[PDB]
Design goal:
Blueprint (H helix, E strand, L loop, with lengths): L3 E8 L5 E9 L1 E3 L1 E2 L6 E5 L9 E2 L1 E2 L3 E2 L5 H21 L11 E5 L8 E3 L4 E3 L14 H15 L7 H22 L6 E2 L14 E2 L20 H5 L4 H13 L1 E3 L2 E3 L4 H15 L6 H16 L4 H12 L4
Parallel strand pairs: 1-8, 5-9, 9-11
Antiparallel strand pairs: 1-2, 2-3, 3-7, 4-5, 5-6, 10-11, 12-13, 14-15
Helix pairs in contact: 1-2, 2-3, 3-5, 3-6, 5-6, 5-8, 6-7, 7-8
The protein binds calcium ion (4 copies) and zinc ion.
């Protein structure tokens, strides 16, 4: 809507207070004009029609329980935008400040969230498996990262290319979580997964096998479920990324860690410069080796560490 930029205050899914950029014109709308062509958050009202209605509020205070998933979808979209702009010089998901749209309260008790080719969409969870999913900064950044991939590599959402697509989202979801510096970790979805169980998460990058996912190519899933295991075989790539950053030994292969920032640089360049819609794991390794070579040189520690990390997970 046309209006004036304003600043409201509210509480997110975890009960934390934060300021949000809004727009005033009769109502206060969840419309942040400070980032690119804007960040817009919508109410899906428990339906599956999208986007729903642009979120309108009478007083610019967002403290109702119904408000919490919207506050966080809106705020964390902002943090993710800031990460890509400040860290990678990328303006929104298309690199041309495309408007970012999210819908919350999607369907009833919906235990998922997704990027649908046009926008991010968040369920409220059923209160057992999940609480509203936009409460997870890694979840928001994971979904917005699918948009980045759509506009760059275009990794097909099946088999190996799909597992890379997924890992790319977990990698940058995590790097955004670190960027915000709010209880950061190498787990995925821990802030919104299973409110009845402490200490678990949907996936682990540091130890994928913790939650049933492979951490070596020899243990890859070869069947047809989950689009050929896109959320399963992502553990192999997640593990390699974790190792590149943090180092360690894994199946008797030693990796010298180079830190998060360089991991982010190498994988961002791989995603935007080398990967293609049909890239496989082997091709990802090559893309990452080439990216590290461009940035740090062929004889660098960074290149050597990329090779050791892929060696460790059995990807040549
Ligand atoms: Ca209000
Ligand atoms: Ca965390
Ligand atoms: Ca996390
Ligand atoms: Ca839990
Ligand atoms: Zn995903």
């Amino acid at each position: 809507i046309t209006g004036t930029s304003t600043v409201g205050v509210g509480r997110g899914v975890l009960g934390d207070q934060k300021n949000i950029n809004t727009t005033y014109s009769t109502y206060y709308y969840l419309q942040d004009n400070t980032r690119g062509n804007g960040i817009f958050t919508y109410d899906a009202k428990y339906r599956t029609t999208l986007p729903g209605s642009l979120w309108a509020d009478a007083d610019n205070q967002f403290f109702a329980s119904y408000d919490a998933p919207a506050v966080d979808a809106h705020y964390y979209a902002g943090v993710t935008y800031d990460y890509y702009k400040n860290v990678h010089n990328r303006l929104s998901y298309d690199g041309n400040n495309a408007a970012i749209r999210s819908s919350v309260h999607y369907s009833q008790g919906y235990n998922n969230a997704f990027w649908n080719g046009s926008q991010m969409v968040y369920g409220d969870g059923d209160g057992q498996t999940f609480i509203p999913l936009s409460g997870g900064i890694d979840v928001v950044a994971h979904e917005l990262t699918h948009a980045v991939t759509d506009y760059t590599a275009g990794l097909i959402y099946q088999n190996e290319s799909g597992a890379i697509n997924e890992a790319i989202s977990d990698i940058f979801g995590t790097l955004v979580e670190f960027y915000a510096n709010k209880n950061p970790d190498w787990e995925i979805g821990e802030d919104v997964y299973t409110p009845g169980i402490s200490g678990d998460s949907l996936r682990s990058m540091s130890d994928p096998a913790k939650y049933g996912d492979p951490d070596h190519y020899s243990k890859r899933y070869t069947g047809t479920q989950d689009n050929g295991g896109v959320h399963i075989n992502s553990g192999i790539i997640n593990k390699a990324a974790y190792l590149i950053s943090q180092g360690g030994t894994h199946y008797g292969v030693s990796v010298v860690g180079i830190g998060r920032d360089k991991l982010g640089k190498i994988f961002y360049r791989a995603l935007t410069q080398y990967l293609t819609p049909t890239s496989n794991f082997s091709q990802l390794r090559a893309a990452a080796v080439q990216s590290a070579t461009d940035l740090y040189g062929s004889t660098s520690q960074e290149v050597a560490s990329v090779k050791q990390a892929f060696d460790a997970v059995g990807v040549k």
